[PDB]
Amino acid sequence: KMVREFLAEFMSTYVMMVFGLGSVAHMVLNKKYGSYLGVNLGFGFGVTMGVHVAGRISGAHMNAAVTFANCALGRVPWRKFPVYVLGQFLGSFLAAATIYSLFYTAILHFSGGQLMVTGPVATAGIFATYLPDHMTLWRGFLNEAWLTGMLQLCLFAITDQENNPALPGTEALVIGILVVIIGVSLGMNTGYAINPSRDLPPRIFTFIAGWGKQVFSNGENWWWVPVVAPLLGAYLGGIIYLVFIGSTI
Amino acid sequence: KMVREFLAEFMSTYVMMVFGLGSVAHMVLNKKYGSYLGVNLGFGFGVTMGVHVAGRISGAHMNAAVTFANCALGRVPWRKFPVYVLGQFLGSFLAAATIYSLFYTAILHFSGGQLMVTGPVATAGIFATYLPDHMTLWRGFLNEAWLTGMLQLCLFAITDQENNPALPGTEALVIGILVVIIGVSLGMNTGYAINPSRDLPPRIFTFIAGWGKQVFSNGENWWWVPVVAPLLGAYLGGIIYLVFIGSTI
Amino acid sequence: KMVREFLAEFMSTYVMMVFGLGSVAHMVLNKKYGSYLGVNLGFGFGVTMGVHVAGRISGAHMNAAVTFANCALGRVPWRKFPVYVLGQFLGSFLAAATIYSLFYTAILHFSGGQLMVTGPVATAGIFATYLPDHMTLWRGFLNEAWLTGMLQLCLFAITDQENNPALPGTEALVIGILVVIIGVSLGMNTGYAINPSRDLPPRIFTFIAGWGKQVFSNGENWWWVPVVAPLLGAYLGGIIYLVFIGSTI
Amino acid sequence: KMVREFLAEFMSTYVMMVFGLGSVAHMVLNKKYGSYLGVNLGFGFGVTMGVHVAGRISGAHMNAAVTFANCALGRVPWRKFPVYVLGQFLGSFLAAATIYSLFYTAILHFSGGQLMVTGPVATAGIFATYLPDHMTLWRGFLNEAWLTGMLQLCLFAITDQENNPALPGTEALVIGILVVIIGVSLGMNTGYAINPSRDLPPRIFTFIAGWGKQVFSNGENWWWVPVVAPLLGAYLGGIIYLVFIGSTI
């Protein structure tokens, strides 16, 4: 049943965003002591609930890039890939809407205090990822592909039962721990936008909620690299597994 | 027998408060370096000990709402729901008393130094949850309903053995990290008062311990929303499971 | 084989102290950002390695109080109890000696800078536990018995295989998590001196390393309550298990 | 085959550096709020991903000393030890290069702002470990030998299936938390340079990247003690197991 699979992908990427976008909205509009580790450990734990909640029906894709890499390297149906990508896009667009509906007055009061009419530099940083001042567009690629490819290589190493002792239940906890490490050690280079649907659907909402063109560009065009560099990174990560380790098991 | 269930619900909600109220009492009266994540991670870990201790004989109903939603969607005995709720109330009222008996002089010295005669503004924040300055009564509902409904939806997804990775033992640990995420990403909006018995029984004690009406109102009528918003949130979260995922298993 | 059991109890309480005493020496003599959670999470993780390392031969007692409670409530040989208590006393006295041998110059330079001739108020706080200014001797009892009794009731609930799904390997990780919660929510009341041998053997060393009478008294006599209140608390915690929950499984 | 083992030791020590060097590079060039625990917890979690990824074909020898001690006490092929060590060196030299390629402009802007021409005093602290101002060369030995010997003694106790609770899958996670404890309780004494290949291959890169002699000496001759003290510590830790516990199983 497909609408069985789609429905979980809507909700499970939601849990990811509300738990991932909630913790950063808490950071900029709620004066919370959130350190780099406190946003990664909560995001990685949140993506683990997304694995736990929606494991049975989908396999917990929650990523347009791990779905495109499971088709090219994991014999997942190509008939399922478009229906999947449109569901965890819509599930993240609605995720941002509810976290802004619950923080509604935290925006108008933080912006009112700091006299931010255009928040496309700090406040929108909550919904989706944005580059640091000290790098540029082609550097985000190298950063997003090299990390999404490392996610794909553990996501295959944890689900690989022909590898070190299989983790019956601890699989989803370490997949979180993994992104915790990628967000803690490289999250400040691009925001660890591992997922094209973790970053674009919130942008199209933030576009709606009064941020405009700058939600896509982010000063210097930035919406391309969250959508294409992860898809170009998860494939590089999937091939290097089946060749460098999978051909060795 | 039933007096087994009640006795554990008394003790198991106790473990929650003393571990949860202890960690925040440490914040205002013991000059501890405690972040939002360190109080959520300690509360969620504490609720996990509450699952572990009193799971085999109770099912770990540490929530007047998780009991009311397991009765409406989990065929729990309706004869057991009132007796269940009175043990987890009395177990939390006694929980606050022991943590106030152990911190007794930390109150009288903190207030004596800061000339706090009426502490229903900061210090009672220890026992139960209180709204932030920037929102109001109808705002707690959206926050408490939308989050208790996210709790109920994992608490069902974690105990769902027809969802792919079965968690033999990691169930109670992942329920903890879940509230760690809800307290870290939305805990400053209402205090994540997910349980009507996590918030009312400590208030009736703080009422006794010299805080007065303001323990119930907290500036504005804040004792209603912990008691009614979780119950209306756990039902929405329980129906949203069996409809959006359960009809998807 | 007994010297088989003793040898592990020497070493496994060592691992506890070096990992537990190391993190606090790092706090006072090495200017490390250690928050209340960073000392509890590292101690609880350290006591978990102590369970992991020395599980097979002893059962990971590491506590003169859990050994005296396993004899009265767990049919452990009374012939083994004295040989056990003298080993994880000596194992903690040597543990403090090596952590002071590695931090040797961090004492003489911190004391040299802060002109501390007598360090029995802050510096010795690293080796063993010491009361806060705002409570007294009879209050430490209530604090140490009520917490050591909560340790004993989880340590029995995690090893109880007739309770919720047994934790094959995750047992030792949650025993740490438990003390993490007791040190995070009540560690500032007495130092969570759960173990009589975690606190006395380091004192007899600190007595040696140039701290004198004040290592035992701590301003106001303090060495009695770490040694007797845990033994009086682990028994209260062991009886309440087999009666309030064990008689219900 | 052997070229399977080498290839994974290249990649698996890479994962360690990029996750370990990334998290501390974030500290000096990215103005991140990073505590001692947040860098140890991220390094130890990263070393756990190194165990998980390359366990089935290597056994996860991510340490020139853990290989040399598994050969002397674990009947590992002596023919495999040199080829093993050259892959985990080259894999760490390339690891630093990719984390310096991703942080490239964060160096030139941090040094340009702080007028750091020679950064072998703070910034190279990113790639490899460096002594603190308050100790000297013979002090690193006691610290590096006593800790690498504690690592080797758990790494054997975790993989010891004749020790009570067998950890099917939790093995790699608990090895991580162990170094989290060693980096949190003794990491400021030497940088917990437990692996000769965690500390030398990044230096030879930092030598290349414009840091010069001072990457090897670090004020005083500090490149020797990461290479020789771990090897002398892992042997003491391996013998202390099979003698104090292994003859106790």
Numbering used by the authors:
A (entry chain A), B (entry chain C), C (entry chain A), D (entry chain C): 32 to 280
From the paper:
Aquaporin-7 (AQP7)—together with AQPs 3, 9, and 10—belongs to the aquaglyceroporin subgroup of the AQP family based on sequence homology and permeability to H2O, glycerol, urea, purines, and arsenite. Moreover, AQP7 is abundantly expressed in human adipose tissue, where during lipolysis it mediates the efflux of newly generated glycerol. H1-H6 and two short α-helical segments (HB and HE), provide the framework for the internal monomeric pore with its selectivity filter (SF), built in AQP7 from residues F74, G222, Y223, and R229.
In our AQP7 structure, X-ray crystallography captures AQP7 monomeric pores in a unique closed state in which F74 and Y223 block passage of small solutes. Despite a resolution of 3.95 Å the high crystal symmetry (F4132) and additional presence of non-crystallographic symmetry (NCS) makes it possible, in symmetry-averaged maps, to resolve electron-density features of many amino-acid side-chains as indicated in Figure 3B. Uniquely in AQP7, the NPA motifs are NPS/NAA, eliminating the proline-stacking interaction characteristic of nearly all AQPs. The crystal structure of AQP7 reveals (a) the arrangement of the NAA (94–96) and NPS motifs that form the NPA constriction in AQP7, where the van der Waals packing of A95 and P227 in AQP7 replaces that of the conserved prolines in GlpF; and (b) that residues F74 and Y223 in the SF establish a wedge that excludes glycerol, suggesting that our structure captures a closed state. The SF of AQP7 can exist in two alternate states, one represented by our structure, with constriction diameters of only 2.1 Å or 2.2 Å in each monomer, and an alternate state revealed by MD simulations, with a constriction diameter of 3.5 Å. Moreover, 2Fo-Fc simulated annealing omit maps show clear average densities consistent with glycerol in all 4 monomeric pores of AQP7. Interestingly, monomers with the inward-facing Y67 orientation house only two glycerol molecules, whereas monomers with the outward-facing orientation of Y67 have three glycerols. In stark contrast to GlpF, we observe no ligand electron density at the selectivity filter of AQP7 (SF).
